[PDB]
Amino acid sequence: ALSGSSGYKFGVLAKIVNYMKTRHQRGDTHPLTLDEILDETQHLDIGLKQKQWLMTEALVNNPKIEVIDGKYAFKPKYNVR
């Protein structure tokens, strides 16, 4: 269980969601590649483990993340008003 702490994966994912949410809020609701997200979220160095997990777990199961032109976008509809 997460008895020790809670940051690995979770923190980065929350920052990605928050980032996309904010960038989407101001006007850039357009989709963004995985790499484009890393930079703005300060997760360029990241690591193969997280990078892969984001691609084949986080940015696919996360409801707020909408897959459009293969890239990852934020989901406004049926969630935010």
UniProtKB/Swiss-Prot annotation:
It comes from the Eukaryota. Residues 1-81 bind DNA. It is found in: Nucleus. The modification N6-acetyllysine is found at K9. Recruits TFIIH to the initiation complex and stimulates the RNA polymerase II C-terminal domain kinase and DNA-dependent ATPase activities of TFIIH. Both TFIIH and TFIIE are required for promoter clearance by RNA polymerase. Belongs to the TFIIE beta subunit family. Tetramer of two alpha and two beta chains. Interacts with FACT subunit SUPT16H. Interacts with ATF7IP. Interacts with SND1. Part of TBP-based Pol II pre-initiation complex (PIC), in which Pol II core assembles with general transcription factors and other specific initiation factors including GTF2E1, GTF2E2, GTF2F1, GTF2F2, TCEA1, ERCC2, ERCC3, GTF2H2, GTF2H3, GTF2H4, GTF2H5, GTF2A1, GTF2A2, GTF2B and TBP; this large multi-subunit PIC complex mediates DNA unwinding and targets Pol II core to the transcription start site where the first phosphodiester bond forms. It is linked to Trichothiodystrophy 6, non-photosensitive: A form of trichothiodystrophy, a disease characterized by sulfur-deficient brittle hair and multisystem variable abnormalities. The spectrum of clinical features varies from mild disease with only hair involvement to severe disease with cutaneous, neurologic and profound developmental defects. Ichthyosis, intellectual and developmental disabilities, decreased fertility, abnormal characteristics at birth, ocular abnormalities, short stature, and infections are common manifestations. This is Transcription initiation factor IIE subunit beta. The gene is GTF2E2. The chain holds residues 66 to 146 of 291 of the full protein.
